[PDB]
Amino acid sequence: NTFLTKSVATPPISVIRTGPKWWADPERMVRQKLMYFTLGVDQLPLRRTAVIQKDLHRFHMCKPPPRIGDTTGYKRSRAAQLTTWYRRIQYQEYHLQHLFTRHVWGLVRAYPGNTTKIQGKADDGYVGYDSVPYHRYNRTPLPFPAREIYGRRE
Amino acid sequence: TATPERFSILGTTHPKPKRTGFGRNNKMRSKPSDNVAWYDKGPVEWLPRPVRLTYDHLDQLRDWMMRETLDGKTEEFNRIRDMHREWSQHPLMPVLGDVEPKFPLNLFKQNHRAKRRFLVRWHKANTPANWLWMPRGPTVVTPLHHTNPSQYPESWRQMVR
Amino acid sequence: NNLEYKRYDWQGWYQRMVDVHNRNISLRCRVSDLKRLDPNGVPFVDMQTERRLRILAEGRVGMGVLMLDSDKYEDQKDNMTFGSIKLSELLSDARKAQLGEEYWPSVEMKVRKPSGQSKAHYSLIDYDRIEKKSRELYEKYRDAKKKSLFVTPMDLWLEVKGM
Amino acid sequence: WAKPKKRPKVGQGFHEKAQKWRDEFLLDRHRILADSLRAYVEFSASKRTEPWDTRFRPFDRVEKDGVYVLMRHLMEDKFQLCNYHHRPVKRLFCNVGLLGPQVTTKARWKPYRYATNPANTSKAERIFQKDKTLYTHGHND
Amino acid sequence: LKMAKSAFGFYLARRGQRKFPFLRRPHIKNTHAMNLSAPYFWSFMTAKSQTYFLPEENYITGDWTGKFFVSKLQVYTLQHATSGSTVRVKSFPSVFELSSPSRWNIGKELNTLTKPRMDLIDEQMLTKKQRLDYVKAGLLPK
Amino acid sequence: QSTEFEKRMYDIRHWLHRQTTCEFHTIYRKNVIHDGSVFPTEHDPATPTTHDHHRMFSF
Amino acid sequence: DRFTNSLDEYAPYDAEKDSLFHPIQLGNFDEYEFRAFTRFLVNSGELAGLGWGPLWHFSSDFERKLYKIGFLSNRNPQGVIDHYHQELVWRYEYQRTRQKQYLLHRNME
Amino acid sequence: EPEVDAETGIAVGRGCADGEKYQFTALLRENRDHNGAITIMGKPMALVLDNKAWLMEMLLMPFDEANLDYRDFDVHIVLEGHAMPSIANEIAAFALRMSIANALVKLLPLTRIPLKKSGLLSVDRRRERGQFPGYLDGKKVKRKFAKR
Amino acid sequence: VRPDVPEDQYVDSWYVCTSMTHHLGDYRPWSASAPPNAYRFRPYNEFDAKGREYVEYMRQFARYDPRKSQGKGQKGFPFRDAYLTKMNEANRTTPPPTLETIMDRAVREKHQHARVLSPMQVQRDVGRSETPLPCAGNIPVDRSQFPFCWKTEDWYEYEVAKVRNKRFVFENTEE
Amino acid sequence: PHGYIRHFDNEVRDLFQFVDGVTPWKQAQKIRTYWEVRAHHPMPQFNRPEVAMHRNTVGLLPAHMWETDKKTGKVKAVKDSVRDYQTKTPLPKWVQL
Amino acid sequence: NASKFPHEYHTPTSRFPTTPKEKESESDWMAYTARYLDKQFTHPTEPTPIYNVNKLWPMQQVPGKIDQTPFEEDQTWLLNPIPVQQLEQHHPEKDLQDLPFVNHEQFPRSLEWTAP
Amino acid sequence: ISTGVFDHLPFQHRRQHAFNTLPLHDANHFGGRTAYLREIGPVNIKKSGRRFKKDLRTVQFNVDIWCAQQTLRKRWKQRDWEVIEVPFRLAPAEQQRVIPEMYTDVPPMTDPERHDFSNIRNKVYDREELQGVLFGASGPLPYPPLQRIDRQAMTLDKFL
Amino acid sequence: GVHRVGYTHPSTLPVPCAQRWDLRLARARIFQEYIEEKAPGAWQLEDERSMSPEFKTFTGYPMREMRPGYGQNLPDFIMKKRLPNNTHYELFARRDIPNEDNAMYGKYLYDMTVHGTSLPSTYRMHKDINKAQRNDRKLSGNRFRVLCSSGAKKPPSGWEPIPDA
RNA sequence: UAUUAUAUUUAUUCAUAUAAUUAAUAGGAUAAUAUUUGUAGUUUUUGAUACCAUGAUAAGGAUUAUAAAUUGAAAGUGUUAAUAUCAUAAUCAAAAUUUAUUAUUUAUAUUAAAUAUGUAUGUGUAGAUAAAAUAAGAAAUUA
Q: H14 near H57, Cβ under 8 Å?
């Protein structure tokens, strides 16, 4: 794991909105599915999201379905509940992927990026070789060299 | 040489006052930001930092898997499978009228930063501790995964009559 | 030129600039038309001589033809004589291959490094002496294992000057 | 386009106040250069601390075995000689030959500025408080 | 430009913060000269190969009547300290005499020694507007 | 090669049209003699011309 | 980079000129072994749930999933093992929407 | 009508993406020996297109829309535009698929109708915004605007 | 906005955002820029812009002679893809059909009593009978000829040699 | 000849000959190198930090011309060396005027 | 003391990668074990064709000069003392045109001009 | 064919570190080579910052030299052969004709009339077959003759 | 590897053959090629963007030297450097003067040939016409600035100028 | 009403000018002859200048559209063609920041070619602000 400097915190909604660019990054959906097929877990969530985004990509170059001029307006919050179920599906999936990687990194004994919490080894985030001698979120002075996380037998 | 022990005019010049704050215009203070992560809520901090898994890590994991699998070990396996059965149950259909609130318009300019700031500062507070839209707990039944670490096939000397 | 620089004060020096820009004189020759007989009765250039020529000239030849671009002199007649001289001189050079094999130009062979069938013997080379010094160093090592925690080959067969 | 105003006159004697100002400025540069070369060459000849990172293999192995035993049993004199500086350290590693290419591909080395602190430092404030008057391009202690 | 420091401010526009090609500038405003570059002393703002001949404010090429000032392009050498003579650089505003000679200067050009942009600024050339502006950027107090 | 035709070709340089000019490329076969006394195909000398004889400004 | 843990070797080899051993030629799968091995994959990953499961009405049948796998691999064994996995992102499949149209077209009549 | 190179057994069908940067041609050849093989720029397709499924399935799709079997054809995909090191991109694969679609319309015509209908013979009339200095990235963004 | 007529009749005006015709409005219709009854006004009703060039490349390779290529510029350079597929090593062997495919075609032809057809033979047509069938219905399969496979130094040396030998044209041969 | 220097073979022999015919050693003598003058710096030589940064020695540091306060370890000021600066080879041994 | 300081004194000819000073017999693995590991090894060096090995291929190099070959491991370039092109970028012919944007041309000749 | 990133990225506004965004000159671009073009911190534009790590064309030239370094690494790694200057008399027959130089004629065929159009610029010969040529008169052959593999021989490969 | 460039005579081998460095020497003799000897063996870089056809700009010739230590300062550069004699710099020089007629002939010569007199500039005759007219309707605004004043401050023996009104 | 969607994304530390004389034509070898080889009347005017000295081409999106089509305009932004009557200010190197109208490179490896920026580590952090529906992938409150 090379990238160990600081990272930018983006919410799931915008991490998903990047659509088929990185959210439905097919080669990233695949490479996280490989973590699941290694660990021996069912890929129910990532496969659900892949189905949804395959639909969305197939029906991105197309126009929405026509609205009717209803003062009573039902289509609106119905398509709203539809979208926000898709969104909640993807929020769950986002969390599953993050959890599996931050656990598999404690299993491979590999260090995560800076202040990337891994509850497999340390209840707080991994701070080490940082652009600041203070904790980026706790404001705790860093040890030199980077703090050590796993055992020493490799 | 023979560095003079008194300085005439160069050292007397007006002191350029150091930049007070940091960041843009060197004015952005030292106080918490939208970006701060939380270690008290979930195994994945919220908001999380972006991680990136590589094929190096996929192979290291595959090799770790061969070793922990041929050492008779299945305990970290059943830990994996339980931490999977925690968060991978289908979350309920949202109640009709439940929607992520967009930032209300007609306060800031269209290109402002407070629009996305409120979005990030609410998506932070909506932690996994606040995920009430998915089934989690001892109140959930799982008709799709296996109930006890005894139904896993590595302990397959248990179901035999 | 026949638009504008045809006629006045600038006609002269523009004619200069033009014909100097064009002063190049390309000379192409057919190596098959060097494959002739010298009136001495000797073939002017044989296959070995063509080899020496193609190897004397890196990029001047192509598609069985040798090209030299006389770029030196401003006057095209002088590029002509210069290119003729250089061509004739590279010919006199390449013609040494009609003096003996000591001038036949070598070939470049992509001689492969030693393969595995001949790399396998590289562990048994001097197997007798290596196993003997094994049997002796092993006794010094069995001795040493009471002296230090780890017995490196530095105290067995690896040697260094102390200073 | 408004007609650009002529720069007003420079003033009285200021041509010579700038003379004396720059004079004692290069005067001050005399000592600044002296002290800065002092600090840079002590930085150079000082035995530095580890350039690698102990967070990756093969430098995550124990400080007793593997590439560490090779480091103690072939290069332990050379590194102390050449002052642990990451550049000669990595080149002695390239010439040790029994690690292959790994001294880049698998080895993780500290950043350029985490690498150039002297031997055995334990603070994070060292790089962020090194003296800012020694114009070493940060090549001082 | 706006306030014509030279007669060419009368002649050349500004073009805002016009972005320029790397190293192509109609006005060589060596605003970086006096830059102490500790291990790079005989390299930064100096000639490239150490074994070079001198530049050419270093030899009287003809039969001069004399000169009023040398350039910064003439290196500082033993004759610039021991001879103790007058060596002048056309710096702002009129000229700058190297009359306090030292030996550390020996070897480089005088660019690393003639401060291009001064830390002391005379409000005697600034405008009633520029002075408040330099207060704004933190140069003169008020 | 017919120099008379070429004469007829060269004076299109004048009756060409408006704002139109002409560059003539001529690629004509020639005869360059290689010759014995002057350009000898002798053996290598005794003293070998090493890399020193082809240094800068040695040309 | 799917070859980071590959060895920076690039170098050639020759089974005959580089070994005392006798070469046993294990060429690529026929569509035969491809088909048997892949039926095992695509259906036991179900019978253990490691694959599509209750989302099975989205990825195609066997005789088209296999057509896709064998195309994307050229019957290659590794291509098969990894295009049974990249099956997630197969974004040009219409068997299921054409069958859903058949059901929501006939289950009227 | 079928316009197939009589002696050679090939259909030569053109395709393009971005109109400049990707411009390929399919030499699509009939294969009476069931030995499936798809080739791009003289190399095996998996090694060209990086073994990526969502990128090579589009290159398969024409045979699906024609109900034909990829095992009885031979296809080389030639690059005639901005050659690049790596063309494993969606825009490139779309160019490949259009080229193949015209190759198959040219080898078996009546397969035009499914190809027409599926829109494989469709040209996305799209390009980037050209290179402009008035744009900071050259493409879209105009430099910062500021009122007095 | 201007007649439908072969664009080479228009010239883009200077200084005027229009387009005028070099012959002053005198026109010749699309069908003057084509052979009589030319299909899609093609140069030869056989193939399109890329069909012509590549039928030609395959033909030039079939008639390629190396002793003839000398003294010619990049024109005597053979087909880049054909020369390369000829040059490749592992293409010297043509893989046979899979034995399962022989058994499959045979269970159809012997057992199931119907003949399997090549795609150029299967009547995809609906109403009119596609007879006669394409005469290509019997072409061989040469992994040494098509598909185009080759190695990279072949590709590179070929293209850079093509590039550098642009000038080495002995335009005065004795043909 | 036109183009590069590498085609002016007669003119260049000619230039060598003319330049030696006019330019005397009594003029080309004084022309210094950069190093022949840089020699008299109190630190004439210090290895660049690239390679021989591990070859920099303390002994190069002219502490005989500056001074130190031990309470913090800094060199505080520089003695006048332009006074006692006595060189036995003001220009090197090859220089006769 | 010119060689005591490697990077100060670079001739307008000096070129990189700056070759290291040679040890005794670093040639191959046979000679390496013969002199350096097993001083009593049987074989002097890898038995050498009496002919010419143009190791440095195809670069014809000055004999009697100790040279390197183009490296194999992608580490040594990262870990060499090779600089990056900092100042302007010249080519002795292109430098007439002074930049890409202001690319000069004497005559309006075609860019695909086939000079005779 | 190379899934590496050859081009340095356009010098634009600051690419941050989130999903799809790294530092424009982080440690992973060009195997860590962006260390030679990286500077640290929100650089003061007027006074600090190297003027040549802000331009696009020079940084792209550096990156191009580094890509060329890579091509050279892999190319010279790809050699298990060395070029041994054999005289004309002894070289095996495929190297006895007029082989035009590199980039001179089409990369020439080994021999057409013998069913091998194999690259003679890419034909590799083994020492243990050229032994009679080079060190033929040097006593005991430093390598053994090659052991062959018999494909007519009835072994497990012929389903017995 | 660190290999000593060795070259054995055509006499040592028990088959003589022309060796390739000697052929290099014959070629650097024939075409006056400078043999740079500091040329290290580890730097045989080729410009892929220009030599490798997997980029949009494949040229086939190494359109530049992949060598960062480059500049016109070097003699190896100055050797292979096209000089500005008879280049576009000269053409621009000899045809780009502010007025183009002054590049085809001299203005007085052209005037005395086609007309009689040598005419002023359009700008001058503007000034002169304005003189002709603004000294017709009014006077007393002028000045007397000359090149030489000796003849005005000192008129000839006669020439007593008229006082106006 | 219909001939149909902006609430999303990415953004903000911004600077470069210098050392006065603009007034005109003057052909050279391979040509049936010019020393015209070396063509000598000083001093009667004055605007584009340091100074009033007319004109004439930019930046700026908010309702002519979908098909075989481009998401950039006239209202004129320094150099330009008729007002005269303070003064020579014009790059051939090395140069002096106050000028709103600017996208900086972010922690594995940091000075070799005309020299080439030594300062600002800090919870991505006040206020107000920038850009964009165009090969990328956006979806619902018309005047």
A: no
